[PDB]
C-alpha cells in the first residue's frame, strides 16, 4: 500500500492544478515534493 514509481530530482513528482495535487512519483532521498514548483526539492 503506497508503492509508487521512483521520481527524479527535476521530473514532476506531483501536479498542482484544478484543486488537489496529482501524485506522479516519490522524491529521491534528500528531495521533497514541492507542490508550488512541482519538482523534487
Curated annotation (Swiss-Prot):
Cysteine disulfide partners in this protein: 7-25, 13-33, 27-40
Name of the protein: CART(42-89)
UniProt organism field: Homo sapiens (Human)
Amino acid at each position: 500500500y503506497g508503492q509508487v514509481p521512483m521520481c527524479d530530482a527535476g521530473e514532476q513528482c506531483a501536479v498542482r492544478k484544478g484543486a488537489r495535487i496529482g501524485k506522479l512519483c516519490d522524491c529521491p532521498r534528500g528531495t521533497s515534493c514541492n507542490s508550488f514548483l512541482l519538482k523534487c526539492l
